[PDB]
């Protein structure tokens, strides 16, 4: 979608593995606030929006 029509989504009830990302692309911009990406896979969350 375009910038003024961003595509909100909710993602719950799942065993979420954040290492499927790394097979995607060179990832020009990838920076996390409040949590380090390396120690992400272990932690649990309330509600994950994308």
């Amino acid at each position: 979608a375009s910038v003024y029509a961003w595509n909100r989504k909710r993602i719950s009830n799942c065993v979420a593995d954040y290492s499927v990302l790394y097979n995607f692309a060179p990832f020009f911009a990838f920076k996390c606030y409040g949590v380090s990406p390396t120690k992400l896979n272990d932690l649990c969350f309330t509600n994950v929006y994308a």
Binding site: G34, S36, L43
Partner: protein, 49 residues
């Protein structure tokens, strides 16, 4: 209230300890008050600050 003085001494000491224990919950600006979360969800370089 004949024994006001002794009772007052006891209450002052108790209240001081209470405020000292309660103040552990305040965050003082950190992202969280408990050390475990800070040390769990963050790399060491940022966990320092």
């Amino acid at each position: 209230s004949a024994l006001g003085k002794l009772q007052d001494v006891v209450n002052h000491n108790a209240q001081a300890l209470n405020t000292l224990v309660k103040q552990l919950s305040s965050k003082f600006g950190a992202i969280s008050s408990v050390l475990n979360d800070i040390l769990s969800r963050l790399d060491p370089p940022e966990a320092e600050v």
